[PDB]
Design a protein around this ligand. Structure first.
Ligand SMILES: Nc1ncnc2c1ncn2[C@@H]1O[C@H](COP(=O)(O)OP(=O)(O)O)[C@@H](O)[C@H]1O
Ligand SMILES: Nc1nc2c(ncn2[C@@H]2O[C@H](COP(=O)(O)O)[C@@H](O)[C@H]2O)c(=O)[nH]1
Ligand code: ALF
Ligand SMILES: [Mg+2]
Length: 195
């Protein structure tokens, strides 16, 4: 379904700032953006809400919906399942809002194979040391999950240098600066949606 404005795919390693930046964008520009609410089998973190951050489901329920053809894409990431349901994107497109998706690098490649034609943005830390610091400060994951996330970060940061893969790469050193660069990448779309 190609409906409405060009969607936005935001990716980057675990801990890079994706959710922090997207929450800011949806607060400032609530009238023109809508968030695709993915399914995940991971457990919710304090403050996360079902139907807002994710649909938190069991492996059994997610497998039922996968088998029925309910997903545009799905991926295994650091021991859990994640995916973008068809209805998650339809809900935002039906409101004629810019659909924002937060997905991993596998999801980026999955979406490249669809008809969605998004802009692809990668948010990256200044270094893997800083990434680990931010992840361990958050400490919402077990040690095993952190190890998996740090390994995925190193692999996916190298893979994201692929030419033509990402339209924009933003280094999240300072959040205020990264957020301005996020809006810069979307500035013409934001202006059109306001008109
Ligand atoms: N520029 C920054 N400087 C320091 N800490 C940050 C910055 N941006 C985000 N963080 C923190 O890093 C952690 C990871 O950010 P988050 O948005 O949860 O990552 P993601 O959603 O990409 O996995 C959070 O604790 C967040 O508060
Ligand atoms: N492929 C895919 N990845 C997702 C989806 N939802 C979240 N992710 C990704 O899974 C990783 C872990 O998410 P987190 O557990 O930190 O919320 C992040 O890279 C995030 O973007 C999804 O629907 N599809
Ligand atoms: F979106 Al995450 F660690 F919170 F990749
Ligand atoms: Mg997040």
């Amino acid at each position: 379904h190609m409906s409405g404005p060009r969607p936005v795919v935001l990716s980057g390693p675990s801990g890079a700032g994706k959710s922090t930046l997207l929450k800011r964008l949806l607060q400032e520009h609530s009238g023109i953006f809508g968030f695709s609410v993915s399914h995940t089998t991971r457990n919710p973190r304090p403050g996360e809400e079902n139907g807002k951050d994710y649909y938190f489901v069991t492996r059994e329920v997610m497998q039922r919906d996968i088998a029925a053809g309910d997903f545009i894409e799905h991926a295994e990431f650091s021991g859990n399942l994640y995916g973008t349901s068809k209805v998650a994107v339809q809900a935002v497109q039906a409101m004629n809002r810019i659909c924002v998706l937060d997905v991993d690098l596998q999801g980026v490649r999955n979406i490249k194979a669809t008809d969605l034609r998004p802009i692809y943005i990668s948010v990256q830390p200044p270094s893997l040391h800083v990434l680990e610091q931010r992840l361990r400060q958050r400490n919402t994951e077990t040690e095993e999950s952190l190890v998996k996330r740090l390994a995925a970060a190193q692999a996916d940061m190298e893979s994201s240098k692929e030419p033509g893969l990402f339209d924009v790469v933003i280094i999240n050193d300072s959040l205020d600066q990264a957020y301005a660069e996020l809006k810069e990448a979307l500035s013409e779309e934001i202006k059109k949606a306001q008109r």
